[PDB]
Design a binder for this molecule. Structure first.
Ligand code: CA
Ligand code: CO
Length: 127
């Protein structure tokens, strides 16, 4: 009911590569967890949503901000929603308003930990 459970592992994989948000949802939650034994400074994962157009600027601004800032640009207005950066055994959650989304506009989800975005991305669609 308006949520999705997603795992990021030690092989730089999310266990899903497309998310559908029911247009009847007013709020959507992602619950992210890290299986596998690698710590945050080495295999850090987050979930960040932007438009497809904005993803490259977010990833590259995020790398420039460092582990200090969970590899995101503070108050990045291109970020529709994001979790915390997590390592092995931690979990994190974000809810967001579906009013921030529109049908047929392209959203991506991705990890901004350095170089992770090449494998760790997928589509987010308002059905
Ligand atoms: Ca949270
Ligand atoms: Co990652």
């Amino acid at each position: 009911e308006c949520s999705v459970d997603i795992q990021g592992n030690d092989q730089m994989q999310f266990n899903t590569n497309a998310i559908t948000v029911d247009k009847s949802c007013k709020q959507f939650t992602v619950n992210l967890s890290h299986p596998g034994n690698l710590p945050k400074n080495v295999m850090g994962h987050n979930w960040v949503l932007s438009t497809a157009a904005d993803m490259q600027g977010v990833v590259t601004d995020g790398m420039a901000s460092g582990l200090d800032k969970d590899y995101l640009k503070p108050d990045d207005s291109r970020v529709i929603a994001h979790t915390k950066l997590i390592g092995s055994g931690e979990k994190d959650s974000v809810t967001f308003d579906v009013s921030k989304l529109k049908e047929g506009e392209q959203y991506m989800f991705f990890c901004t930990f350095p170089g992770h975005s090449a494998l760790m991305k997928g589509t987010l669609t308002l059905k």
